Amino acid sequence: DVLDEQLAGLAKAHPSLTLHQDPVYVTRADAPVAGKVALLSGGGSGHEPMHCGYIGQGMLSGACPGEIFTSPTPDKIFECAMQVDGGEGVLLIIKNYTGDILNFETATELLHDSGVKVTTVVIDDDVAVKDSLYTAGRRGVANTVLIEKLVGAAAERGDSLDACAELGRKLNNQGHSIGIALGACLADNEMEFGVGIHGEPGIDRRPFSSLDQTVDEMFDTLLVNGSYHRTLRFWDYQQGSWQEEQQTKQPLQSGDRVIALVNNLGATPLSELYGVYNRLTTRCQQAGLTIERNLIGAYCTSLDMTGFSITLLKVDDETLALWDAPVHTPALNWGK
Amino acid sequence: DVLDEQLAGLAKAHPSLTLHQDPVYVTRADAPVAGKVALLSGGGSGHEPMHCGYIGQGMLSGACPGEIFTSPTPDKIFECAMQVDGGEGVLLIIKNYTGDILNFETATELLHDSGVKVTTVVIDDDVAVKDSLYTAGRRGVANTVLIEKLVGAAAERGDSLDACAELGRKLNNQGHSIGIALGACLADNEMEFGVGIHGEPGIDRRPFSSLDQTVDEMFDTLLVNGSYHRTLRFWDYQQGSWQEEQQTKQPLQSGDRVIALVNNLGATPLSELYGVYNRLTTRCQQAGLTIERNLIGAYCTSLDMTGFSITLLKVDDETLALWDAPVHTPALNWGK
Numbered sequence: 001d002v003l004d005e006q007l008a009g010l011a012k013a014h015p016s017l018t019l020h021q022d023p024v025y026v027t028r029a030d031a032p033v034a035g036k037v038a039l040l041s042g043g044g045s046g047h048e049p050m051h052c053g054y055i056g057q058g059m060l061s062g063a064c065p066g067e068i069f070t071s072p073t074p075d076k077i078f079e080c081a082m083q084v085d086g087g088e089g090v091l092l093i094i095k096n097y098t099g100d101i102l103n104f105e106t107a108t109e110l111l112h113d114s115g116v117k118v119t120t121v122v123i124d125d126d127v128a129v130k131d132s133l134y135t136a137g138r139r140g141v142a143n144t145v146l147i148e149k150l151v152g153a154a155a156e157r158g159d160s161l162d163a164c165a166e167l168g169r170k171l172n173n174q175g176h177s178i179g180i181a182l183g184a185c186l187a188d189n190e191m192e193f194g195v196g197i198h199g200e201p202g203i204d205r206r207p208f209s210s211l212d213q214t215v216d217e218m219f220d221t222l223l224v225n226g227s228y229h230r231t232l233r234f235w236d237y238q239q240g241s242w243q244e245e246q247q248t249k250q251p252l253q254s255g256d257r258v259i260a261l262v263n264n265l266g267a268t269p270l271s272e273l274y275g276v277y278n279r280l281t282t283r284c285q286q287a288g289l290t291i292e293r294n295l296i297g298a299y300c301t302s303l304d305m306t307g308f309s310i311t312l313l314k315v316d317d318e319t320l321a322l323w324d325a326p327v328h329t330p331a332l333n334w335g336k
Numbered sequence: 337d338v339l340d341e342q343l344a345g346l347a348k349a350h351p352s353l354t355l356h357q358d359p360v361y362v363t364r365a366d367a368p369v370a371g372k373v374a375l376l377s378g379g380g381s382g383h384e385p386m387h388c389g390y391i392g393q394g395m396l397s398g399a400c401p402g403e404i405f406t407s408p409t410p411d412k413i414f415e416c417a418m419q420v421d422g423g424e425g426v427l428l429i430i431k432n433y434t435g436d437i438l439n440f441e442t443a444t445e446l447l448h449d450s451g452v453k454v455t456t457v458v459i460d461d462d463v464a465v466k467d468s469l470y471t472a473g474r475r476g477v478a479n480t481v482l483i484e485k486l487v488g489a490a491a492e493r494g495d496s497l498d499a500c501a502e503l504g505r506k507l508n509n510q511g512h513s514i515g516i517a518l519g520a521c522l523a524d525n526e527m528e529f530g531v532g533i534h535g536e537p538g539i540d541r542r543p544f545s546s547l548d549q550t551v552d553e554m555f556d557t558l559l560v561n562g563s564y565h566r567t568l569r570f571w572d573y574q575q576g577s578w579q580e581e582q583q584t585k586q587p588l589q590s591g592d593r594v595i596a597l598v599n600n601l602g603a604t605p606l607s608e609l610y611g612v613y614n615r616l617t618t619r620c621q622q623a624g625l626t627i628e629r630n631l632i633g634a635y636c637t638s639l640d641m642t643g644f645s646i647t648l649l650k651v652d653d654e655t656l657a658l659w660d661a662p663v664h665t666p667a668l669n670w671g672k
Contacts, residue, residue, distance in 0.1 A: 002547070006607045009614030013630050048606040212341075267603035269640050270384040271342045278345030294349050298634070304605050306640070335671045 003045055003067065010052060014330050017055055025072070025080035026052050027062035037155040037164050038062070038084040041093040041148060042077060043100050044069040046185070047197060050145060050300045053331030059152035060329070061086075068303075069198040071099035077107030081116060089117035089161035089237075093148060093168065095140025096124040097198075105242070108235045119161060121168035122232045123147060125177040125311065127225035128194025128203055137230050139196050142263045142300040142311045143175035149332060153325035167322075169234070173249045175313035176226055178218045179265060182208060185303030193217065197265070197302045211272060215279040218310050223287065226251030254288025258312045259323060264298040266305040273297070273308060280310060293323055299331065339381055339403065346388055350666055353391055361408070361416035362388050363398035373491040373500050374398075374420040377429040377484060378413060379436055380405040382521070383533060385667040386481055386636045392665030395488035397422075404639075405534045407435035413443035417452060425453040425497030425573075429484060429504060431476025432460040433534075441578070444571045455497060457504035458568045459483060461513045461647065463561035464530025464539050473566050475532050478599045478636035478647045479511035485668060489661035503658075505570070509585045511649035512558045515601055516550060521639030529553065533601070533638045547608060551615040554646050559623065562587025590624025594648045595659060600634040602641040609633070609644060616646060629659055635667065 011019035042064025051063035061084035066072035094104040123140035181195040194202030228249040236243040347355035378400030387399035397420040402408035430440040459476035517531040530538030564585040569578045
């Protein structure tokens with residue numbers, strides 16, 4: 001099995017990780033880490049390094065890869081959570097797709113019944129389409145990475161489960177993303193505008209004229225599709241039930257300070273991502289948005305898709321301190 | 337100009353870098369760093385992050401990007417060297433291509449004529465073809481990155497120009513690389529075996545049967561094409577002349593300890609690189625090679641070429657300590 005070989009490769013390359021079998025999941029080699037909230041995510045294979053490359057101090061305690069573009073099954077999530085539980089609870093970060101929501105929610109209930117204190121954060125940052133074939137609402141994409149790092153820092157600092165969960169839900173309401181594909185993982189010189197990370201259709205297919213023009217269209221969409229009201233359920237561990245919570249996003253606005261992630265969906269040359277970043281800084285400056293930090297690279301992919309996404313996450317001094325906090329993972333590494 | 341936009345993007349993304357104009361080159365924002373050997377490289381654009389993503393503490397003092405797949409002109413190299421000169425010499429790392437050799441060698445003479453103490457290291461690690469399209473000898477490829485890190489660590493701790501040069505030349509004789517392409521940056525299910533990073537032809541075109549079989553062919557070739565005797569010129573700054581030096585490489589052999597770099601030439605998914613790494617570990621174990629450290633990712637590219645390269649560099653305890661030493665650049669970051 002090729003997925004087997006790929007995960008074996010991951011494990012051999014990174015002694016800081018432990019690959020488990022029966023069921024398969026990956027954790028930090030030092031898990032369970034006593035006295036800290038444990039953070040977990042997962043989803044289909046094919047988005048590497050999301051989420052396995054984000055396992056480590058200051059970020060995820062473990063992750064649960066599934067088959068290609070397919071949520072892991074509940075047994076993997078349950079077993080991974082039980083392995084990383086440090087006695088302060090486990091927070092599950094779930095990207096908004098039919099499969100992931102079902103499987104992670106099932107695992108949440110199984111955990112609660114086994115006495116594990118658990119709650120959830122749903123990610124729905126893709127501003128492009130509401131109600132795509134495999135999502136109720138908006139899709140969860142690259143802002144998931146930014147939230148993992150920020151919530152990861154908070155957990156590492158010693159924040160409680162509730163505090164980590166509230167922070168995750170708040171950041172989710174402040175991050176906005178959009179992706180484009182020039183070719184899947186249709187017509188030449190044509191792009192899928194607002195594509196999903198499993199290849200889901202976007203807003204439309206339209207001509208590619210230039211990188212700068214494409215970035216302008218993506219940026220404009222982030223500015224105008226920002227307003228959003230919807231229900232997101234979260235697990236209330238005190239009552240042992242799902243709580244429907246209305247959640248509101250405000251549009252990005254002049255005066256906002258942001259973290260920008262220019263993300264390779266798979267086969268875009270880094271040179272081009274820097275070109276994208278250049279146009280993006282220009283547009284943010286014109287719109288009154290201050291980019292405070294950035295990430296540019298392959299962080300949330302879709303196999304070998306030719307395309308890229310832009311994520312802008314509103315932040316404040318406190319959030320920037322969490323960003324600057326140390327992180328030690330395969331894909332993201334920085335010290336104090 | 338697209339290149340202009342991409343370099344501006346690089347500069348805006350990384351305050352640790354300074355982009356210069358008239359002529360264009362990039363340096364560490366803190367250069368010149370007094371009292372340390374300054375390390376520089378450069379080459380065509382289209383291999384990002386090599387070399388601009390390696391500018392930073394523990395690695396390059398600056399780099400000189402040229403036009404796509406084209407060496408920078410001598411003025412860019414000269415001005416970059418003068419900007420980073422810290423009074424202890426400048427070491428130029430040159431990949432072995434007709435253009436790069438001519439331009440860096442011309443810049444070397446100009447520097448010497450201007451009173452700057454300089455010397456060079458030529459990289460010729462690609463074992464695939466001798467006398468390719470644009471190279472006298474063997475081509476300089478991804479081992480250039482490992483050498484920049486190792487010599488970069490040596491310069492950073494205060495080693496002399498001579499010691500840094502000697503180290504680079506020694507490492508060059510110990511590193512071996514080969515790349516393959518499935519599609520350029522021809523026939524279906526066929527690969528260019530031993531492809532060059534500018535898209536130069538390889539050993540041959542052959543069928544692609546599986547990832548594991550491809551890795552086996554690549555690995556076998558590294559084992560059998562290892563032995564190599566050739567002349568590499570270096571600048572003798574005491575005599576003010578080029579010195580023709582015979583240099584010898586031994587084949588990789590049972591008992592060797594190595595650093596392995598599995599490198600995306602452009603559009604290979606990370607999942608596939610881990611699969612490559614998994615097979616590579618098996619083959620190394622069978623051959624008696626101990627992999628002590630690895631790097632897996634997009635480190636020395638060829639636009640959006642679909643393909644990857646494998647580099648194995650023989651090392652010892654001293655070299656491993658240089659590898660583990662702190663490095664803080666756009667592409668590579670680790671501390672103690």
